[PDB]
Amino acid sequence: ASSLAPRQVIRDGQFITSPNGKYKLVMQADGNLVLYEDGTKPIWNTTPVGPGAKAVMEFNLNLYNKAGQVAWSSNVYTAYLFEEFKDEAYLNLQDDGDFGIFSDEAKWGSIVLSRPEVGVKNKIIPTGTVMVPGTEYINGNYRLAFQGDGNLVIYQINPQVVIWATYTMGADRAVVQEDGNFVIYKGTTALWHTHTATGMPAYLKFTNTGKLFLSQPTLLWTLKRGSLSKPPKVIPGQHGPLDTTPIWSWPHDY
Template sequence: MTTNHSTVVRARRSLRFAGLLTALAVAATALVAGDLAVTARPASASAVWVGSAPAGTTIAPGDQVTSPNGQFRLIMQGDGNLVEYGIGNQVLWASNTSGAPGAVAVVGKNRALDITRNGKRLARWASAGTGQSTALKVRADGTMALLAGKKVVVNWTNFQDRVLSGNRILGGTVLRSDTSATRTLNMRTDGNLVQKQGGRVVWQTRTGGHPGAWVELQKKGNMVVWTRDASRKKVALWSSRTSTAGSGTLLVQVDGNVVLYGAKDTRVWSSRPVTGLAWPVNGTKISGRYGDDRGAGHVPRYHQGTDAPVAVGTAVYSSGSGTVTKTVANDAAYGNYVVVTYGLTTVLTAHLSKIEVKKGQIVKLSTEIAKSGNTGQSTGPHVHVEVRRNGTLVDPLGTLHFR
């Protein structure tokens, strides 16, 4: 079965795509689209569609559709869940139909993708309109699309913004900071690692001319672009020179930077100089994002800030040189909170256990202003961060860089 972008191969032969099938079967737990998606060991893989699966295809348990180089993989699992995995088996999307063993995914010609079991539909993604759908595509950046010819009739904006140490980024793979596709990191098939912002190249390794090159995120902390010479020996083309940083994370950030974090979750390398205001705690973990729909009954319904899930008593720092303009204790919603003003920008940190500054106090980047807590309307220990520019709420991750 063949299309312009798709080749079906049997599982034993498909293992050449980076040895990915066995690792995929390992059970994992991840938050996907606000729901807990628990992956399960799929049935023995029978077919792999590379790039796209043609309309009319039934994706049975164990079957998968991959991006062109195999780094993003959409798998129909034996538990009934259709799951897309990224690099390092990171879950990017799930149909949330687990608990229905034997279910299949049907790429219909009727402009729909259905999950069914025994003829009963469990889930559907569809688009009205004329013209038959022709293929389900998994792209090089993790997005998926149901196509009618070249026209996208259903689009999934899944993305991967980070890769953990111990993994590779193969040629042809694109990482993105968010669904907008404005900020990307592309390991090109010619061997050049390129960062773009708004379609413009802002950084690159200048290692083009080496088709087949790849990026390795070493557990000792180094990020290396490798190729092979005529004798098949590995040759380093570029390195971050961070081999003492320890195992960490490469992150494509919404502030327009690409940053390598070490074992202590602190920045050890970045593609661009870091300027501006800093995130108020050490660490890169995020639990709630700006603009998240928290459901009916929440006031405000849409999350006004971004949450850092840290233990009670974690140090909370100033984001730069500024002035403390408000300190409030025992607010019904925010609990204990502090507002610091940096020119036209204010940063609010809330749910604190202890406030360590006073109104009017001048602070700098290294000033500890509070301890994190679980006060006010908080369902667990974290720091809630809100940013306003000229009085208008903005996404904190677009203004503050991780330390």
């Protein structure tokens, strides 16, 4: 895996790896968070905090000691750190060895939430996905289907219940676009879309509570570039056999 999911913990020699296999970020049993090149050359570290330590992705990437204190932190510059950000923010380790933190706000949703869903889990539908009639996605007791008849439907699986639909009869494709929009089409005719064309790539989240949201990557911080006041344009990365988060890369300079 090349990423860390919200709240993920790693410790005692657990690690992630850049898509190309060259860089590895390992939270060591001696409590040193270390970036390795080719498996053998360490090229960055926190330095060790000692045994019983751990690293957790919780808005910041935070290094804790046995005693439960934070010993090192990404120290991402934030207005507020709302507890819900810790449930949302994720990290990617990329092919030139940089790693960065994303915290993305929903741009669109099948429904408007009065407040965050506790312990919700998102099935990520990545930028560039083209759904074709017959495509479906399953998360818990819900199913997102792009149907033979062109409708995009969210069903509760057992018992079977329609929760939401677009009624885009005759659509032959739905595209999660690089420009930021999610668009259902017959041919080149857009029958329905989210109105989120920003030029920052889209991805979708399909929840285990029967909801769909579109977000776009908002890169806040990298190891090499520190905190970023404006999020740069990033590009879909190589989805891994299973990663749980979106995967991106970002340019080295301008």
